[PDB]
Design a protein around this ligand. Sequence first.
Ligand SMILES: *[C@@H]1O[C@H](CO)[C@@H](O[C@@H]2O[C@H](CO)[C@@H](O[C@@H]3O[C@H](CO[C@H]4O[C@H](CO)[C@@H](O)[C@H](O[C@H]5O[C@H](CO)[C@@H](O)[C@H](O)[C@@H]5O)[C@@H]4O)[C@@H](O)[C@H](O[C@H]4O[C@H](CO)[C@@H](O)[C@H](O)[C@@H]4O[C@@H]4O[C@H](CO)[C@@H](O)[C@H](O)[C@H]4NC(C)=O)[C@@H]3O)[C@H](O)[C@H]2NC(C)=O)[C@H](O)[C@H]1NC(C)=O
Ligand SMILES: *[C@@H]1O[C@H](CO)[C@@H](O[C@@H]2O[C@H](CO)[C@@H](O[C@@H]3O[C@H](CO[C@H]4O[C@H](CO)[C@@H](O)[C@H](O)[C@@H]4O)[C@@H](O)[C@H](O)[C@@H]3O)[C@H](O)[C@H]2NC(C)=O)[C@H](O)[C@H]1NC(C)=O
Lengths: 46, 172, 140, 49, 53, 48, 141, 177, 81
Amino acid sequence: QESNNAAAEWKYVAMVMDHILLGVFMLVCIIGTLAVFAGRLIELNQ
Amino acid sequence: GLGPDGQGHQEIHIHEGTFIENGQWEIIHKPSRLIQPPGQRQEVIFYLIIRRKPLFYLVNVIAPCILITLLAIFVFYLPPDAGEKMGLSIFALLTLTVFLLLLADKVPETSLSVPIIIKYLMFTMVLVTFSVILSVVVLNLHHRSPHTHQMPLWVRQIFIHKLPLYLRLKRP
Amino acid sequence: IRRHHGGATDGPGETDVIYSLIIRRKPLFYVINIIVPCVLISGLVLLAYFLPAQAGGQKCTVSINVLLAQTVFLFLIAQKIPETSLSVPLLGRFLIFVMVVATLIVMNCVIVLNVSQRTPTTHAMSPRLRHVLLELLPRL
Amino acid sequence: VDRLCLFVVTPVMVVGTAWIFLQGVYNQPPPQPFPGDPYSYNVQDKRFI
Amino acid sequence: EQEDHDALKEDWQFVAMVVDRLFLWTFIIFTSVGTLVIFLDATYHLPPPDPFP
Amino acid sequence: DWVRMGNALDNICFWAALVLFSVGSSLIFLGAYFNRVPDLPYAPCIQP
Amino acid sequence: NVDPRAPLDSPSRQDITFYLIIRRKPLFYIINILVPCVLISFMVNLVFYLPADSGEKTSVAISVLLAQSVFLLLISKRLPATSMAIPLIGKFLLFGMVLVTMVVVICVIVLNIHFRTPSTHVLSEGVKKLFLETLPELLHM
Amino acid sequence: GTWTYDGSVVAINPESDQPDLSNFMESGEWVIKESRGWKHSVTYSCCPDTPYLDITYHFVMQRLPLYFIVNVIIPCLLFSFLTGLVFYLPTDSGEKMTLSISVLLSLTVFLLVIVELIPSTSSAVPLIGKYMLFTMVFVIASIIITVIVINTHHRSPSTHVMPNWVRKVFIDTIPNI
Amino acid sequence: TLSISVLLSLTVFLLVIVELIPSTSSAVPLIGKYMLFTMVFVIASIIITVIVINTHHRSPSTHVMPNWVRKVFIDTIPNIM
Ligand SMILES: *[C@@H]1O[C@H](CO)[C@@H](O[C@@H]2O[C@H](CO)[C@@H](O[C@@H]3O[C@H](CO[C@H]4O[C@H](CO)[C@@H](O)[C@H](O[C@H]5O[C@H](CO)[C@@H](O)[C@H](O)[C@@H]5O)[C@@H]4O)[C@@H](O)[C@H](O[C@H]4O[C@H](CO)[C@@H](O)[C@H](O)[C@@H]4O[C@@H]4O[C@H](CO)[C@@H](O)[C@H](O)[C@H]4NC(C)=O)[C@@H]3O)[C@H](O)[C@H]2NC(C)=O)[C@H](O)[C@H]1NC(C)=O
Ligand SMILES: *[C@@H]1O[C@H](CO)[C@@H](O[C@@H]2O[C@H](CO)[C@@H](O[C@@H]3O[C@H](CO[C@H]4O[C@H](CO)[C@@H](O)[C@H](O)[C@@H]4O)[C@@H](O)[C@H](O)[C@@H]3O)[C@H](O)[C@H]2NC(C)=O)[C@H](O)[C@H]1NC(C)=O
């Protein structure tokens, strides 16, 4: 039981890292898309 | 040029027993018209209206994509414990990408409109992408545990009691 | 301007004008589209050693699929490289080196899985290798 | 269920493959170049006047 | 305690199964509608009955 | 104990393969620096 | 060839036509495409023999489907897109892909059955008798 | 311009300041936004008497991007979206690496597709090429991070006890941040 | 996964090799014979791997092992080395 709990602590830490990384990467996707396209999209609009 | 009877047979003449029949295109209408000027010059315009015979693309593109879509549906019937759900869904997407590589040699490069087959391929890719996303959601739900999450009352109510009755599922 | 001797019969000479265009390739296109992708893909192979040699691990999966990706690049690269046999391109040497290293990593992953998946019902542990791996290596 | 589906599908696969490939293999040009013409047009059958 | 943990895990797995069935049904519906619309549009595209309408 | 031996093998082989890859790739790419166009007595084709 | 209907002054009335009836030498294609395509397609029969506990049954079938897709990409570039008939190798590819899809579906059903539990499904006594006594006896399991 | 005749011998003049576009067949790929023709008369240091004439027509063409958008951007967008999704897949599934690497494979195959479409110019990086490189690097980074997370999840407390700083950050603060 | 990915890579490489090999059907090229050898070798390896995996997952639910298999693989072979 002690060993399983100690391993589950690492599993929980990995899950929290997973959540943070999911949020960061899903933000980075749109950040990069806008960063590359928006300049020329504005230029062609204006 | 008039017809052999002297009638205004304004048509492309085709020797019916000598014409070399094209394997992909069928000639439907073949008229001609004299065009009057609006330096003015007249024009004689001959019109070929031809329908594409689609069997090649039916066999080599559409049916494979139908099969891939059918497999992408059955992704949801695979139990989460099998551990092959991502493999199946992404390999289906890869096969669709290979068939997209096939079709890219065939499609016109003009950007005035989108071919219906390209719309169909993009719709199928969207379907496979959503199948992947929903399979990831299902697998996320499957591996939740009291060591990591506490199920809220609304999830318990809806999914354990309400939806099974609609889906004709019953918990043993 | 070149002047050439005639034949051994002392025939009339000949004259040529030769211009030598020494030209240099702009490498940017291949660095972006081929070199950097292949370098990063080959770097991905070294990540396999951090995948646990345990059930659910995907060490061989990663290594073999990275090798398949490198074979797809080999298809892509072979469209660009000319077919002459006088020498091997630097990009080709790098590609072959990467593929050889990837096969070595596949072999190492297979060896490590064969070590980790052993059981007392099948293998008697050698005490020398046990001491070396568990004691001598940490002490080294 | 696995063995049942094996015994169902495998002979279907084999029979279909054989039916396709044997239909292909026995495709041969007709012994006369024009069907309905008995002449061979071969160099051995010199059709003297 | 292990039995209670297993009961909670089974609850989560049942939720997952119900969600999987709901996704299966919704995906069937979306696929059938989209494919039917596309094929109907492709099929109704007959050649014109008149070269100069 | 077998798992621990496997982990030790992984840990040593990681560093071995990393060094091998880094050295080989660096030495392969290094030729790009040395084989630039040589300096020659000829004037540049396009004047400044 | 003399066309009796064409006017004597028409250019189409007479011609001399030389014909070539030529048979393809198949050995190159047999070695390079057909044998690989058939062998890879027949690989799918092993999926039924592969145990479910390996967790690799769908992988084989879907990868063979991918390989058949690659072969279809290769072959379709070598022939004109006519509608007169499907080429023999095209018929074989279509039939093989249909069977591979069917085997994928069958494998998904088999795996769904394998991981069933009394926490999620009820194994009826009639089903037990049918699939553990009668059918294995018929199949010589 | 006249190749061998100079402006003191043959003079060329534009008929109109713009090219005649009245017969222009509508292009399916480019839109001519504007056009003009300018006459130029350069003089060289040998000869003030002999100007050399040319007429330079020019066309400002803007591409219709819809073909490239549909046939490149959408699949790349799908791959980019699936790239981040892996972090929602639990490690216990045992499929995070399969997902990430198979996405990478699909992206490589689509790169093999892309090379047929995009220009092989080396003068400057295309915007589409920059986006492709961005997507590839994003996939690679996601794979690296997934490997790190997997190595964290399966870590054994027998050899690696959790240090107090990792506990106090991730267990305590992160879910309460 | 390993054997199937090797087969996939070999097929992707065949996709590149078929266009380089001459289509002259008078005789098989030596490289073509080598490719056929490699393909058949991979296929046989996959078949035998499936047989071995099926063997491994057997249990007493499959009923008793035949005594000759025990005599060969459990007794004889490990004593021969
Ligand atoms: C490779 O390709 C080449 C072409 O690229 C193929 O060559 C063709 O071969 C076929 C098979 O023989 C040829 O078809 C036959 O042609 C002859 C010649 O006809 C012409 O000459 C006649 C006088 O010289 C003239 O009467 C004919 O007019 C007839 O045909 C035209 C065309 O449609 C009609 O408009 C007319 O009204 C008229 O019918 C023409 O100028 C024909 O005699 C022959 O006709 C027989 O067969 C037809 C079906 O095959 C029947 O419908 C006919 O009624 C007729 O019937 C036949 O009569 C024979 C005499 O009694 C009898 O012995 C025979 O049994 C009987 N058959 C039947 C089925 O009843 C037919 O049209 C074709 O013209 C060739 N084309 C060329 C040379 O350009 C070659 O075969 C290919 N090789 C392969 C595949 O291996
Ligand atoms: C295939 O493409 C052809 C052209 O590429 C199509 O031909 C077009 O067909 C339409 C339908 O009939 C015509 O439109 C008609 O044109 C006449 C004549 O217009 C001229 O004269 C009037 C004065 O009478 C003048 O105002 C115009 O400017 C023209 O000088 C009109 O009287 C009708 O109202 C109507 O507009 C097109 O003119 C015709 N184009 C050509 C170039 O012939 C053909 O229809 C297409 N076929 C199919 C099946 O789609």
